[PDB]
Amino acid sequence: MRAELNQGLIDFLKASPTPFHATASLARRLEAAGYRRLDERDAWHTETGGRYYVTRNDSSLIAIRLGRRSPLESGFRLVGAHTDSPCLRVKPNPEIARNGFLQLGVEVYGGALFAPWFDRDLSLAGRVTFRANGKLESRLVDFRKAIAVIPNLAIHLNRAANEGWPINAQNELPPIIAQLAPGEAADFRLLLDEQLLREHGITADVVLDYELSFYDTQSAAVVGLNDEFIAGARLDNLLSCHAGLEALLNAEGDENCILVCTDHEEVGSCSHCGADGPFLEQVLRRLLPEGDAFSRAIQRSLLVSADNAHGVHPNYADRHDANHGPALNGGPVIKINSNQRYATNSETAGFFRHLCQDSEVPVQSFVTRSDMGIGPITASQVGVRTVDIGLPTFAMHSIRELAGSHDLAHLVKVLGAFYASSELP
Amino acid sequence: MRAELNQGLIDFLKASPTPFHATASLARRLEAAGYRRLDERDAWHTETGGRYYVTRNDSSLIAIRLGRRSPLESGFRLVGAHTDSPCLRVKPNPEIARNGFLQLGVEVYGGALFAPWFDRDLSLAGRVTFRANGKLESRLVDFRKAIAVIPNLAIHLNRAANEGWPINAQNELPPIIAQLAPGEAADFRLLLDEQLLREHGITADVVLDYELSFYDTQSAAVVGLNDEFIAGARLDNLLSCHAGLEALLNAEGDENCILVCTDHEEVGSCSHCGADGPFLEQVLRRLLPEGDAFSRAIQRSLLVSADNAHGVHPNYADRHDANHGPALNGGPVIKINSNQRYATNSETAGFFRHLCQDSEVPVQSFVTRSDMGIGPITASQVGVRTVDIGLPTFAMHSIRELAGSHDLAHLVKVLGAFYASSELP
Amino acid sequence: MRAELNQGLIDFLKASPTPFHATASLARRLEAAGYRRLDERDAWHTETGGRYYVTRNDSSLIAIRLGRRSPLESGFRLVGAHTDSPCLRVKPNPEIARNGFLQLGVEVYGGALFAPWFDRDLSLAGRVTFRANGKLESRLVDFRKAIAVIPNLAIHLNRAANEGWPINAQNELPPIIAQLAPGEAADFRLLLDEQLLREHGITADVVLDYELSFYDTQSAAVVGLNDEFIAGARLDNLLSCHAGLEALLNAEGDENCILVCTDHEEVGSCSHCGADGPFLEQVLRRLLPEGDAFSRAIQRSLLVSADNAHGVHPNYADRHDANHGPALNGGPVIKINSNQRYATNSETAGFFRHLCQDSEVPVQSFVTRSDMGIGPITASQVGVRTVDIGLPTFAMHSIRELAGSHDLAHLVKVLGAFYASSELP
Ligand SMILES: [Zn+2]
Ligand SMILES: [Zn+2]
Ligand SMILES: [Zn+2]
Ligand SMILES: [Zn+2]
Ligand SMILES: [Zn+2]
Ligand SMILES: [Zn+2]
């Protein structure tokens, strides 16, 4: 059922307010399915038929199904996605006290659209690092309830509001979380300490640092007269993580299947744990002999880089090429850009397109208007052929994005077919 | 305590997506409390101690509680508010069919902030006028389900989105409600016919015209670390309708109490339907003898004109006068403006300020900055002394506004004291 | 003594006018301390307790102390800095003869602030490549004495000078080094030939090419009423090279310690010998077995990326976030940017912050104002966890920068503690 898949997506989104939580949610499903967690510090002893996963920074995840045939001779079938989404992150000395409020200073992470973050019931989640019994450790928190808001200024006090103004992030985006009594101090670290106790039963000696993201408490939901759509934060790109996961868990065949979901894509993938890092490469090498084996394996592999595409928006149709306007619910989009903003080529495109035909999934094509500006990055790190595809969406980088409610099922089906395909060379 | 009043506010907002629904929700409460509906076409026979309400256009409502002393000799204690809120309304020939979608053309009603309407799960409600069995009639509909969305354009296709642009309402605000099959015709009036059957069991011969408002399906909610806040559409001015109602229904004493909630305030009033139409005057005259009575009664009356004020916003604090920055949860604000943008005067202010003190409710003062730019309308109709007050809020005319969670109780308390107050200035 | 450390810094800066000289100065201290130079062309035979260093391009240096425990099981403790600083470099056909002067045409290297280069007594140093007895070779030169000046134009001939104008580098930055007699030719290569003889006793057959940087002859100096400050060119980032070196040479414990100081950071680190090159990676791999060993080692390692931070400047305080304005002499700054302009995360931040606490060194936090723009690069090359820290400074990329005179000692102490720390996983 599309309906079961879509509900599964809504659940996953709800459990995944930050890249740490997305990674943990992926890990829980994998383990329930029998996948064994490996640690990058240990020597591994994997084998044919094994089901494994590994993480790095608790925010990037690689899932591995080793097939019957070795990667050396049959290659890997890889699906790539990303765990991060543009949002607001709490600063390290964040307490702002003004006009009787307590606010938290925020950085903008990734290319967020600012306006939609206003007038939303926000909570806060992510990683907290602390010392307990002279031991340094980390946990995830999620306050869950709506503790914050970034309100708009009344139109009465900003009469040209609808003219547009340059929203200044330093000044306009700090959320209000509380009011302070006369002479009441404010200690955010103390609030985190309370949350650690409440959520984990832990008392910290001291809260040191954290990576906390504001997020919307409004769950994702089906929308539309005929339930055509799905609305929710983080569709870019938890939509693809979830699809890629369902495809891996249900895939037939006995190929070598990889699900790589990396952090830091919204920011250029350049970290210890991003796609422009050697995470993927160092995991794959561990599944092969030394020498030429990795190079040979990779030239028999294909990466399907799954990241949301732009549907043609009816109130802004002129932002698309008239020949390449994807329809929501018209299936996955093959993304082409010969300037290598996407890595797709005629062979990767052709293979995917054929795969969609054999699976009876509709398929679409996108290029940008020629007067407008992980695929290329991972191709360039490990050298693997890549097709960039995505489900068509609107309002990418909003706090609440829109996709087609038929498209997840289309994508799970074709990814399932990819992962089961014994042929690529 | 009044988690009770707040939950009742949340419930009332949910049942009141349009002015028509707000009027119906007010009426259902008043009837539950014993108030009898009069009709403006009939001669009335009212009496001492009687509890009455009347409507006009099904969108404005006046509730009347007649005390023991005649209006002539003890005046009226009036509380004024309004039933309308800025929003988006369906055009009369609305169907727009483009890039495989069905959209509905919309007018902007009142001074709406455009941006917040984007990326929200919208439903649709209001009055439908139709012919059934040869006769003309009206019903309210509320689809309830989230059938519509106005999505943002991806930041990738609008890269200076955050620098601001002038949102064009004709082009960017039509909501998407569906996708159409190739050759599939779109008929909105037919969709209304189905909603009429579904919601009222009525089948129409022909659906003629309607006044339908899009609205947000996310309910109002308490927000903030210590539940300091309430967030929701239509606080302006359903917050005051609800407060006034509660005060009227619970007030002690013996006085002649009026609750006047008019439509069309957000567009200057100036319909048949108020507040500088003659609805209020024509109802009040009917409670008195002919002659000098109305004029005498009105000179012994006071109107407390309740409409939301602007709290000082900490991310935009220079938009207030530093001496006149109301705090959420700081209590009702007395609104002062010498150019009669508010009708408050030293006597109506002083009396209200005194009422708050005796009720132990905190009270605040607002004037605008002297370099920046309902009470006056109704004082100027009828001639009544007026104090303009309001609970302090943020983001007024957004789709989701913010108030203090303590302020509703504060307001109900003082309005109750006003209604029970045997003398005035 | 802070005083001995600071004098050591002043000496090191004086000996290090170019990245080649910085590298040579580091190498001389290391050798005096018993570190043995390895050559990247040779097979290495290193062992526990060994003290080694290697260079690449004579401008990047890696210093290695092998501990008792193998890197495989205890990881590396790495401190990263850079040998290069923004400056002016002589062009390859540089002789400009105009109005009786001889000038040298210059490129701007890195993001130099132009104005401060004017009206300074400059000398010239760096690498010269030549042929002597049919053999190609390189030496360093340093003219030492003040042979050049870039004078300002008199304010009298540029009366709006203080209004600001766009200093054109091609036209305004060539330094004057001499006056030419009527019909005297000018041969810069010949001058270099003389300098080779004078400085090294070498006669070249022909001077081919060179990488020569102008530099300030004014030594670094303590400044301030209470000697609070240190002023000098190249604090960014010879300040960190020097600190990192002192910490390595004095470190207790028996961990695996690395000091990586790379060239070309001011320009994006993208060279044979920069941090975006494989220098570091290829050295570290040589200290480990083949296979998974390097990956495992790296996931037990931590990089402390030490590069100067911005103190809050009292004449420009609004360029900082009010909550994150580091004080000179307030200790090292932990640099955070969730967009990965720094690689620090809650774990690397927390570990460093704790390390400062156990060492009794004050520690500070920096993020940028949210409306403003080697760590991430090396994390992304080798995959290592990284904390970006820096001593707070002013006037970065001037010819004369300012730091706190207490801060070097603070940084040496904490780096010493890092290098001696047996725990990170
Ligand atoms: Zn994406
Ligand atoms: Zn994105
Ligand atoms: Zn209002
Ligand atoms: Zn209004
Ligand atoms: Zn630097
Ligand atoms: Zn620099």
Short mmCIF file of all heavy atoms in Angstrom, two decimals, chain A residues 98 103 112 114 119 121 145-146 151 157 162 172 177 224-225 313 315-316 319 328-329 398 400, chain B residues 98 103 112 114 119-121 146 151 157 162 172 177 179 224-225 227 313 315-316 319 328 398 400:
data_model
loop_
_atom_site.label_atom_id
_atom_site.label_comp_id
_atom_site.label_asym_id
_atom_site.label_seq_id
_atom_site.Cartn_x
_atom_site.Cartn_y
_atom_site.Cartn_z
N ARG A 98 15.64 39.99 26.76
CA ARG A 98 15.26 41.30 26.23
C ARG A 98 13.78 41.44 26.37
O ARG A 98 13.04 40.51 26.03
CB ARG A 98 15.48 41.32 24.76
CG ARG A 98 16.91 41.57 24.42
CD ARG A 98 17.06 41.87 22.95
NE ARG A 98 16.59 40.80 22.07
CZ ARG A 98 16.87 40.77 20.77
NH1 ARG A 98 17.58 41.74 20.24
NH2 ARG A 98 16.42 39.82 20.00
N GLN A 103 15.26 34.34 24.83
CA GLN A 103 15.39 33.85 23.47
C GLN A 103 16.69 33.06 23.36
O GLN A 103 17.55 33.16 24.25
CB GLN A 103 15.46 35.05 22.50
CG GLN A 103 14.16 35.80 22.33
CD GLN A 103 14.30 37.02 21.42
OE1 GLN A 103 14.78 38.07 21.82
NE2 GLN A 103 13.91 36.86 20.21
N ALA A 112 18.31 27.65 4.06
CA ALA A 112 16.94 27.77 4.52
C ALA A 112 16.22 28.95 3.92
O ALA A 112 16.80 30.05 3.73
CB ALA A 112 16.88 27.89 6.05
N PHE A 114 13.89 31.61 4.96
CA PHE A 114 13.62 32.18 6.28
C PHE A 114 12.12 32.35 6.61
O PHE A 114 11.66 32.04 7.71
CB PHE A 114 14.30 33.54 6.45
CG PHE A 114 15.80 33.53 6.34
CD1 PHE A 114 16.50 34.74 6.30
CD2 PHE A 114 16.54 32.35 6.29
CE1 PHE A 114 17.92 34.75 6.21
CE2 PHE A 114 17.95 32.36 6.19
CZ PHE A 114 18.63 33.56 6.18
N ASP A 119 6.12 32.06 12.75
CA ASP A 119 4.76 31.73 13.10
C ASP A 119 4.50 30.21 12.98
O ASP A 119 3.51 29.75 12.37
CB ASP A 119 3.82 32.56 12.28
CG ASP A 119 4.06 34.05 12.42
OD1 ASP A 119 4.69 34.48 13.46
OD2 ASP A 119 3.50 34.79 11.56
N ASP A 121 5.01 26.50 15.55
CA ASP A 121 5.16 25.98 16.91
C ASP A 121 6.34 25.03 16.87
O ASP A 121 6.21 23.88 16.45
CB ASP A 121 3.94 25.18 17.35
CG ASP A 121 2.61 25.96 17.31
OD1 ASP A 121 2.60 27.20 17.02
OD2 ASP A 121 1.54 25.27 17.57
N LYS A 145 7.69 18.96 22.97
CA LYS A 145 6.65 19.93 22.97
C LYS A 145 7.07 21.27 22.40
O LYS A 145 8.31 21.61 22.23
CB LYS A 145 6.09 20.08 24.34
CG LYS A 145 6.75 21.03 25.22
CD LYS A 145 5.66 21.76 25.94
CE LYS A 145 6.23 22.54 27.08
NZ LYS A 145 5.04 23.10 27.71
N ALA A 146 6.04 22.01 22.05
CA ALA A 146 6.28 23.25 21.38
C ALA A 146 6.78 24.33 22.35
O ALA A 146 6.01 25.02 22.96
CB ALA A 146 5.05 23.68 20.66
N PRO A 151 8.03 34.81 16.10
CA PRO A 151 6.83 35.48 15.54
C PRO A 151 7.10 36.52 14.46
O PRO A 151 8.11 37.27 14.55
CB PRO A 151 6.27 36.25 16.75
CG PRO A 151 7.09 35.85 17.97
CD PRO A 151 8.43 35.40 17.38
N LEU A 157 2.81 47.37 11.90
CA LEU A 157 4.09 48.00 12.27
C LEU A 157 5.12 47.79 11.20
O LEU A 157 6.33 48.01 11.41
CB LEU A 157 4.59 47.36 13.58
CG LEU A 157 3.65 47.63 14.76
CD1 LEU A 157 4.09 46.88 15.99
CD2 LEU A 157 3.65 49.13 15.06
N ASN A 162 4.46 42.96 2.68
CA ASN A 162 4.18 42.20 1.46
C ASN A 162 5.01 42.66 0.24
O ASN A 162 5.06 41.94 -0.76
CB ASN A 162 2.63 42.16 1.18
CG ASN A 162 1.84 41.41 2.30
OD1 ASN A 162 2.32 40.46 2.89
ND2 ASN A 162 0.64 41.83 2.57
N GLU A 172 16.34 38.66 13.43
CA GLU A 172 14.91 38.36 13.26
C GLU A 172 14.64 36.90 13.57
O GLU A 172 13.51 36.52 13.74
CB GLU A 172 14.39 38.77 11.83
CG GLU A 172 14.45 40.29 11.60
CD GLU A 172 13.98 40.72 10.24
OE1 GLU A 172 12.83 40.47 9.85
OE2 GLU A 172 14.79 41.24 9.53
N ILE A 177 11.49 31.45 23.70
CA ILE A 177 11.14 30.20 24.40
C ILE A 177 10.47 30.43 25.76
O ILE A 177 9.84 29.51 26.28
CB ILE A 177 12.32 29.25 24.63
CG1 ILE A 177 13.30 29.82 25.65
CG2 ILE A 177 13.07 28.92 23.34
CD1 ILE A 177 14.31 28.74 26.00
N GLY A 224 -4.85 17.59 0.31
CA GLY A 224 -5.43 17.70 -1.00
C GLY A 224 -6.78 17.03 -1.11
O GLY A 224 -7.07 16.09 -0.41
N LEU A 225 -7.58 17.53 -2.05
CA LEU A 225 -8.93 17.09 -2.21
C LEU A 225 -9.03 15.59 -2.38
O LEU A 225 -9.93 15.00 -1.82
CB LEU A 225 -9.53 17.77 -3.43
CG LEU A 225 -11.00 17.41 -3.63
CD1 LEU A 225 -11.85 17.90 -2.44
CD2 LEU A 225 -11.51 17.99 -4.97
N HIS A 313 5.92 24.34 -10.68
CA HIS A 313 4.96 25.04 -9.81
C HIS A 313 4.01 25.91 -10.66
O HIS A 313 4.42 26.86 -11.34
CB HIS A 313 5.77 25.89 -8.79
CG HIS A 313 5.00 26.38 -7.60
ND1 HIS A 313 3.74 26.94 -7.71
CD2 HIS A 313 5.34 26.47 -6.29
CE1 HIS A 313 3.34 27.33 -6.51
NE2 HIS A 313 4.29 27.06 -5.64
N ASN A 315 2.05 28.37 -9.95
CA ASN A 315 2.15 29.81 -9.74
C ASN A 315 3.50 30.41 -10.09
O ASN A 315 3.68 31.59 -9.92
CB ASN A 315 1.75 30.19 -8.31
CG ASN A 315 0.33 29.77 -7.99
OD1 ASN A 315 -0.47 29.59 -8.87
ND2 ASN A 315 0.03 29.62 -6.72
N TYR A 316 4.44 29.58 -10.56
CA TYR A 316 5.79 30.02 -10.95
C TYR A 316 6.33 29.14 -12.06
O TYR A 316 7.52 28.73 -12.00
CB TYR A 316 6.80 29.93 -9.74
CG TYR A 316 6.41 30.65 -8.47
CD1 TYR A 316 5.74 29.97 -7.46
CD2 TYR A 316 6.79 31.95 -8.24
CE1 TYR A 316 5.43 30.58 -6.24
CE2 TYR A 316 6.49 32.58 -7.06
CZ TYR A 316 5.78 31.88 -6.05
OH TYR A 316 5.47 32.51 -4.85
N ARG A 319 9.71 29.29 -14.03
CA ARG A 319 11.02 28.97 -13.42
C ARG A 319 11.56 27.62 -13.91
O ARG A 319 12.69 27.28 -13.62
CB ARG A 319 10.95 28.96 -11.89
CG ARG A 319 10.64 30.31 -11.32
CD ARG A 319 11.64 31.42 -11.59
NE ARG A 319 11.08 32.67 -11.04
CZ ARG A 319 11.60 33.42 -10.04
NH1 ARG A 319 12.74 33.11 -9.43
NH2 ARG A 319 10.96 34.53 -9.66
N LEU A 328 4.26 16.35 -9.92
CA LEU A 328 4.10 15.55 -8.70
C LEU A 328 3.24 14.35 -9.05
O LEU A 328 2.26 14.49 -9.80
CB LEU A 328 3.41 16.34 -7.60
CG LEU A 328 4.34 17.11 -6.72
CD1 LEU A 328 5.18 18.16 -7.48
CD2 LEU A 328 3.50 17.79 -5.64
N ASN A 329 3.58 13.18 -8.54
CA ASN A 329 2.81 11.96 -8.87
C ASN A 329 3.00 11.43 -10.29
O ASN A 329 2.32 10.50 -10.69
CB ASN A 329 1.32 12.13 -8.54
CG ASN A 329 1.10 12.32 -7.05
OD1 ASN A 329 1.75 11.65 -6.23
ND2 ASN A 329 0.22 13.24 -6.67
N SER A 398 11.84 25.12 2.52
CA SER A 398 10.89 25.60 3.49
C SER A 398 10.95 24.72 4.77
O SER A 398 11.52 23.64 4.76
CB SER A 398 9.47 25.58 2.94
OG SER A 398 8.50 25.91 3.93
N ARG A 400 8.15 23.57 5.58
CA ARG A 400 7.15 22.62 5.21
C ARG A 400 7.09 22.50 3.71
O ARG A 400 6.57 23.37 3.01
CB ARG A 400 5.79 23.02 5.81
CG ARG A 400 4.80 21.92 5.82
CD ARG A 400 3.61 22.23 6.71
NE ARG A 400 2.66 21.11 6.86
CZ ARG A 400 2.77 20.08 7.72
NH1 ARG A 400 3.81 19.99 8.54
NH2 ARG A 400 1.79 19.13 7.77
N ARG B 98 -3.90 24.31 -14.62
CA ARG B 98 -2.58 24.61 -15.15
C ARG B 98 -1.61 23.56 -14.69
O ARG B 98 -1.64 23.17 -13.52
CB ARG B 98 -2.07 25.88 -14.53
CG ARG B 98 -2.72 27.07 -15.10
CD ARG B 98 -1.95 28.31 -14.73
NE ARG B 98 -1.90 28.54 -13.28
CZ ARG B 98 -1.56 29.71 -12.76
NH1 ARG B 98 -1.23 30.70 -13.55
NH2 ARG B 98 -1.50 29.87 -11.45
N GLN B 103 -6.49 24.69 -9.26
CA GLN B 103 -6.32 25.72 -8.28
C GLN B 103 -7.61 26.51 -8.24
O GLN B 103 -8.42 26.45 -9.20
CB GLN B 103 -5.19 26.65 -8.73
CG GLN B 103 -3.82 26.01 -8.69
CD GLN B 103 -2.73 26.93 -9.21
OE1 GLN B 103 -2.50 27.07 -10.42
NE2 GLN B 103 -2.10 27.59 -8.30
N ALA B 112 -3.96 41.13 5.05
CA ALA B 112 -3.23 39.91 5.34
C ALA B 112 -1.76 40.01 5.08
O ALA B 112 -1.32 40.66 4.12
CB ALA B 112 -3.79 38.76 4.57
N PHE B 114 0.93 38.12 3.55
CA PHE B 114 0.98 37.06 2.54
C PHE B 114 1.88 35.88 2.93
O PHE B 114 1.46 34.73 2.84
CB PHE B 114 1.40 37.59 1.16
CG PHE B 114 0.48 38.67 0.57
CD1 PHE B 114 0.84 39.36 -0.60
CD2 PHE B 114 -0.74 39.00 1.16
CE1 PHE B 114 0.00 40.36 -1.15
CE2 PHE B 114 -1.59 40.01 0.60
CZ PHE B 114 -1.22 40.69 -0.53
N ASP B 119 2.75 27.32 2.48
CA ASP B 119 3.25 26.12 3.13
C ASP B 119 2.51 25.80 4.44
O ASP B 119 3.13 25.53 5.49
CB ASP B 119 4.72 26.20 3.39
CG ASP B 119 5.54 26.43 2.14
OD1 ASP B 119 5.03 26.13 1.03
OD2 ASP B 119 6.72 26.86 2.32
N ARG B 120 1.18 25.83 4.31
CA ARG B 120 0.25 25.56 5.36
C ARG B 120 -0.80 24.60 4.82
O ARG B 120 -1.13 24.68 3.65
CB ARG B 120 -0.41 26.85 5.77
CG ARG B 120 0.48 27.96 6.33
CD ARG B 120 1.01 27.73 7.76
NE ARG B 120 1.83 28.88 8.17
CZ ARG B 120 2.27 29.12 9.38
NH1 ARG B 120 1.99 28.33 10.36
NH2 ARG B 120 2.98 30.20 9.63
N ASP B 121 -1.34 23.72 5.68
CA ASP B 121 -2.35 22.74 5.29
C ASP B 121 -3.69 23.41 5.51
O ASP B 121 -4.15 23.51 6.65
CB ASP B 121 -2.29 21.53 6.19
CG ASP B 121 -0.93 20.81 6.20
OD1 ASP B 121 0.01 21.19 5.41
OD2 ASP B 121 -0.83 19.83 7.06
N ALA B 146 -7.75 19.00 5.15
CA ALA B 146 -6.79 19.86 4.52
C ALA B 146 -6.76 19.61 3.00
O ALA B 146 -6.14 18.65 2.51
CB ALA B 146 -5.44 19.63 5.15
N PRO B 151 2.01 26.45 -2.06
CA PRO B 151 3.44 26.19 -1.74
C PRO B 151 4.40 27.35 -2.07
O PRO B 151 4.25 27.98 -3.10
CB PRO B 151 3.81 25.00 -2.68
CG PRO B 151 2.55 24.64 -3.45
CD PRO B 151 1.62 25.82 -3.34
N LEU B 157 15.23 28.00 -6.97
CA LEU B 157 14.69 28.67 -8.16
C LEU B 157 14.39 30.12 -7.89
O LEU B 157 13.75 30.80 -8.70
CB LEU B 157 13.42 27.96 -8.61
CG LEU B 157 13.67 26.50 -9.00
CD1 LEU B 157 12.36 25.78 -9.20
CD2 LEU B 157 14.47 26.34 -10.30
N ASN B 162 15.30 35.24 0.33
CA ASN B 162 15.42 35.83 1.67
C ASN B 162 15.72 37.35 1.67
O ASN B 162 15.61 38.02 2.72
CB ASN B 162 16.45 35.07 2.57
CG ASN B 162 16.01 33.66 2.89
OD1 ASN B 162 14.83 33.36 3.05
ND2 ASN B 162 16.96 32.79 3.01
N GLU B 172 0.55 34.46 -7.04
CA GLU B 172 1.30 33.54 -6.14
C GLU B 172 0.43 32.95 -5.08
O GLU B 172 0.88 32.09 -4.38
CB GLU B 172 2.50 34.27 -5.48
CG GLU B 172 3.53 34.73 -6.51
CD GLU B 172 4.66 35.61 -5.96
OE1 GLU B 172 5.40 35.17 -5.05
OE2 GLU B 172 4.77 36.74 -6.45
N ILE B 177 -5.63 22.67 -5.00
CA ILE B 177 -6.50 21.76 -4.27
C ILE B 177 -6.51 20.34 -4.86
O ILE B 177 -6.92 19.44 -4.18
CB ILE B 177 -7.94 22.26 -4.18
CG1 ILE B 177 -8.67 22.15 -5.53
CG2 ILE B 177 -8.02 23.70 -3.66
CD1 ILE B 177 -10.17 22.36 -5.40
N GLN B 179 -5.19 17.48 -8.53
CA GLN B 179 -4.68 17.26 -9.86
C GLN B 179 -5.81 16.75 -10.75
O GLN B 179 -6.69 16.05 -10.28
CB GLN B 179 -3.57 16.26 -9.78
CG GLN B 179 -2.32 16.88 -9.22
CD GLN B 179 -1.21 15.87 -9.11
OE1 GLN B 179 -1.35 14.82 -8.49
NE2 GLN B 179 -0.08 16.19 -9.66
N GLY B 224 5.50 27.32 24.37
CA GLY B 224 6.49 27.90 25.20
C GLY B 224 6.93 27.04 26.35
O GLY B 224 6.21 26.22 26.85
N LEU B 225 8.16 27.27 26.78
CA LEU B 225 8.78 26.45 27.77
C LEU B 225 7.89 26.30 29.01
O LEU B 225 7.79 25.23 29.49
CB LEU B 225 10.16 27.01 28.13
CG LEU B 225 10.95 26.19 29.12
CD1 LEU B 225 11.22 24.77 28.53
CD2 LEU B 225 12.24 26.91 29.56
N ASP B 227 4.59 27.36 28.93
CA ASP B 227 3.24 27.51 28.44
C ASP B 227 2.84 28.95 28.52
O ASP B 227 1.68 29.26 28.81
CB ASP B 227 2.21 26.69 29.26
CG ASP B 227 2.43 25.22 29.19
OD1 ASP B 227 3.11 24.73 28.30
OD2 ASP B 227 1.91 24.53 30.09
N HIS B 313 7.88 43.50 20.46
CA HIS B 313 8.54 42.33 19.92
C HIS B 313 10.05 42.46 20.11
O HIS B 313 10.68 43.38 19.59
CB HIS B 313 8.22 42.25 18.41
CG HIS B 313 8.46 40.90 17.77
ND1 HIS B 313 9.61 40.18 17.99
CD2 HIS B 313 7.72 40.18 16.90
CE1 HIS B 313 9.56 39.05 17.30
NE2 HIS B 313 8.42 39.03 16.63
N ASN B 315 12.56 41.04 18.74
CA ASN B 315 13.39 41.08 17.54
C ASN B 315 13.09 42.29 16.67
O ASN B 315 13.66 42.40 15.62
CB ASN B 315 13.19 39.82 16.72
CG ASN B 315 13.74 38.58 17.40
OD1 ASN B 315 14.58 38.65 18.29
ND2 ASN B 315 13.25 37.43 16.95
N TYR B 316 12.17 43.15 17.12
CA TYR B 316 11.79 44.36 16.41
C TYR B 316 11.31 45.40 17.43
O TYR B 316 10.24 46.03 17.28
CB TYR B 316 10.59 44.10 15.44
CG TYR B 316 10.75 42.98 14.40
CD1 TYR B 316 10.20 41.72 14.62
CD2 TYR B 316 11.35 43.22 13.18
CE1 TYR B 316 10.29 40.72 13.66
CE2 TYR B 316 11.45 42.25 12.24
CZ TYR B 316 10.92 40.97 12.48
OH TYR B 316 11.01 39.98 11.51
N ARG B 319 10.20 49.19 16.89
CA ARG B 319 8.89 49.50 16.29
C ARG B 319 7.87 50.04 17.34
O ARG B 319 6.84 50.58 16.98
CB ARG B 319 8.32 48.27 15.57
CG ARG B 319 9.16 47.76 14.39
CD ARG B 319 9.43 48.70 13.22
NE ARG B 319 10.13 47.99 12.12
CZ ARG B 319 9.74 47.88 10.82
NH1 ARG B 319 8.60 48.42 10.36
NH2 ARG B 319 10.51 47.21 9.95
N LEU B 328 3.35 40.66 26.73
CA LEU B 328 2.40 39.54 26.78
C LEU B 328 2.32 39.06 28.22
O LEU B 328 3.33 39.02 28.91
CB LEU B 328 2.81 38.40 25.87
CG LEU B 328 2.40 38.49 24.39
CD1 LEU B 328 2.89 39.73 23.67
CD2 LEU B 328 2.92 37.23 23.70
N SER B 398 -0.97 37.66 10.49
CA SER B 398 -0.46 36.36 10.06
C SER B 398 -1.61 35.36 10.05
O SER B 398 -2.66 35.58 10.64
CB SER B 398 0.59 35.87 11.08
OG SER B 398 1.11 34.56 10.78
N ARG B 400 -0.97 32.76 11.69
CA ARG B 400 -0.78 32.21 13.04
C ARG B 400 -0.18 33.29 13.93
O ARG B 400 0.98 33.60 13.85
CB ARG B 400 0.10 30.96 13.01
CG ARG B 400 -0.13 30.07 14.22
CD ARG B 400 0.56 28.73 14.19
NE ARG B 400 0.25 27.82 15.31
CZ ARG B 400 -0.89 27.12 15.50
NH1 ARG B 400 -1.95 27.24 14.69
NH2 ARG B 400 -0.99 26.25 16.55
#
